[PDB]
Amino acid sequence: LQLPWVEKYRPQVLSDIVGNKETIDRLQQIAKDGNMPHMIISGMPGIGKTTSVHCLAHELLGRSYADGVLELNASDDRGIDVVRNQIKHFAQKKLHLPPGKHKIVILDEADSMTAGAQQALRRTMELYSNSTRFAFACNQSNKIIEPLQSRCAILRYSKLSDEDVLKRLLQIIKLEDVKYTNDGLEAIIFTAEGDMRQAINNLQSTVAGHGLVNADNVFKIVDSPHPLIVKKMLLASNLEDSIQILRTDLWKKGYSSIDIVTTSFRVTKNLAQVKESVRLEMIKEIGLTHMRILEGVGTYLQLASMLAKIHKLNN
């Protein structure tokens, strides 16, 4: 069978990774130099953290990737016993590598590691840093305990810009010989919201669905991100407009009330235009509505009342 495009076109080299140009350039510098230190890679989902770390390890270790890399993630056993035995034995292993090269322990989703295992990793890093180096990958850098953070260079990935997403999408289209239009690519980028995994998934879905990537064809399957709809609903100057948006764009499309209220809270947390008093009052009203929904009254009437109270707060 044919692999999905997300996995089929996963980059093999750092040069094929787009976005965070300075960070990728630093990674390439490290790869071509060799003296890799303990590092932490943090950022939002689907921006190349796993791809970047794996490509760096591959380029650094060459043929010795199999015997010089130990990869562990949340799907494997990673308790304190694992740190005591498997990681310890790997770090103790005497492996002949080219000068400036070290064994790499990749801990993907390191944030999920237990407190005991994280504390145990301190002594391992202290003892075996001469021949072993650790590459943590996570979404929240603060979820790694401070003693471990103290030894590692931090590297934060930013959300991908529309330009890099468009460039890599054009590369994929050229490889796949996909017919498209500019508006279709713009719609795909808009719906991706900076997540390239979603961008590639939506591109594949659209290409399958109709063959031609148009805006209308893209929007037949992919929907506009609902956080923007919620923001438009909250910022409406008229109660009628807010109610109309809530009905047509959210309720009639099958969005659950709990999702709507959670998204409303998240969006209100980042409303720069509104004042602080109005913002906190809106947060209070949203929380009261959320409490009512959790009790079982997840009705459209409650959301309409929440919108009415928010509009009152605005006035």
Binding site: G34, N35, M36, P37, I80, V83, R84, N85, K88, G100, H102, D111, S112, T114, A115, G116, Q119, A120, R122, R123, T124, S129, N130, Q140, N142, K143, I144, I145, E146, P147, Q149, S150
Partner: protein, 170 residues
């Protein structure tokens, strides 16, 4: 590819990045502890990550242990003077005939003997798995027994605890 924080590590107490008053307080406390009938048996150091607790402890030991260690009566393990000024507990050590929770209990039962001609400073930085309730209870019991021990001679015991918050985990 040596890391700078290790490559340029201090080689003497004068280069340790420590406030002068804190260094004086720690040095006086440890020196008093090294007395034959010292009032204090455990020195507990607490603070944030990377504030020179273990570094200053080791640098001070390098001076204090030779000063107070009794000269051997022509007896020693190997030909060399056995430069083991600091004895550290390892939390990842696993032996065949010992349950995990007893490991620390064993360590102290050995550390008790490092006095006089075998004088050494006991340092506890890599603690046992205190997140396990039973292990923490055993650790506390062992600490209390050391504090209340009737042994006339004991070596100075230093416990360095790095204080940090545990991020919420699923």
């Amino acid at each position: 590819g040596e890391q700078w924080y290790e490559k340029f590590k201090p080689n003497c107490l004068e280069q340790v990045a420590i406030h002068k008053r804190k260094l004086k307080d720690v040095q006086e406390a440890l020196d008093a502890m090294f007395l034959p009938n010292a009032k204090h048996r455990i020195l507990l150091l607490s603070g944030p990550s990377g504030c020179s607790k273990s570094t200053v402890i080791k640098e001070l030991s390098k001076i204090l242990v030779p000063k107070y260690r009794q000269n051997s009566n022509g007896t020693s393990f190997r030909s060399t003077p056995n430069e083991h000024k600091v004895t550290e507990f390892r939390g990842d050590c696993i032996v065949n005939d010992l349950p995990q929770m007893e490991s620390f209990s064993e360590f102290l039962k050995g550390a008790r003997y490092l006095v006089m001609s075998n004088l050494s400073l006991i340092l506890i930085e890599d603690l046992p798995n205190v997140f396990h309730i039973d292990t923490r209870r055993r650790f506390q019991q062992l600490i209390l027994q050391w504090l209340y021990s009737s042994e006339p001679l004991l070596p100075p015991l230093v416990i360095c605890i790095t204080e940090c918050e545990i991020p919420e985990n699923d």
